[model samples]
Target: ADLEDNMETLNDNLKVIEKADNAAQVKDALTKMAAAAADAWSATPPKLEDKSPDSPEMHDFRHGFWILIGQIHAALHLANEGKVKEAQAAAEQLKCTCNACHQKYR
Candidate 1:
């Protein structure tokens, strides 16, 4: 439930980003997503509930989460610079990151 909430929050912000016209608007959505990703990063999925945080499975999970975080920061930086096109591209990469992680984790 917690992870689901995190995903929904991030997903909603993603929609905002996709529809955003201005850099500030994109930044706003990315900002919210960054916060949501922080929460999601620390969550343990149901499939990994039995795994230790130090275990390889958990390590991989955190690795994927951080990649998501990294992409968020990249997109946020582009948005901050008023590079809406680059930021949009970065956001597309962000979706790729999420899809890749989902492929492995979910």
Candidate 2:
């Protein structure tokens, strides 16, 4: 239930990001999400269900997850520059990184 709260928070932020009318709003939402992900990396990373910490898959997932956070942060920076295409390209990388992990773990 607690984990779901964070998921919902991210989903809410995503909606804001998708429909954000200005760089400020998008930056705010992305910052929130980036912090969430950074906290997870620094604190306790929540492993996917059935994904063992002892496995190499877990290592790759963890590494990629951190990279995803950085990508989001960078995307926000690009978005701030009014470079929507570059920003979305970064988002694409983030999404692909996420999808690769989800496909194997989730």
Candidate 3:
């Protein structure tokens, strides 16, 4: 259930990032987003619950999840540097990763 809450936090932060015009707001949102993504990286989704930790399905899920976490950090770094446009562009990459992983696991 914590992972589900993390997902919700991630979703809310993404919405904030999408509407944010200032670097301050973007940085704040990306900070929370990165934290949520980091937490998610360590937690298995419901769909992968039955698989062994070393199984290919779990590996694939974690692989995609790590990419998402990395992407969030990348954007957060840019946002922290006051590069709103570049950070937003990096966030666009996050959207693609989200869809890719969700399609497979959800």
lDDT of each: 0.87, 0.66, 0.86
Give the winner by lDDT.
1
TM, every model: 0.93, 0.71, 0.91
Task: Write the candidate numbers in order of decreasing lDDT.
Answer: 1, 3, 2
Per-prediction backbone clash count: 0, 0, 0
TM-score of 3: 0.91
lDDT of 3 at 43: 84
Candidate with the larger TM-score of 2 and 3: 3
Span of 10 residues, lowest total lDDT, candidate 3: 33-42
Candidate 1 vs candidate 3: the lDDT winner is 1
- Locate the minimum summed-lDDT window of 10 residues in model 2: 39-48
**Which residue runs does candidate 1 get wrong by more than 4 Å?**
none
After TM-score superposition, what is the CA distance of residue 103 in candidate 2 from its true location, in Å? 1.1
Error of 2 at 101 (Å): 1.7
lDDT, residue 66, candidate 2: 83
Q: State the lDDT of candidate 3 residue by residue for 1-106, as single tens digits.
A: 3988988998898888888998999999988887888788778888888989999988888898788878887888898899999987887678899899899997
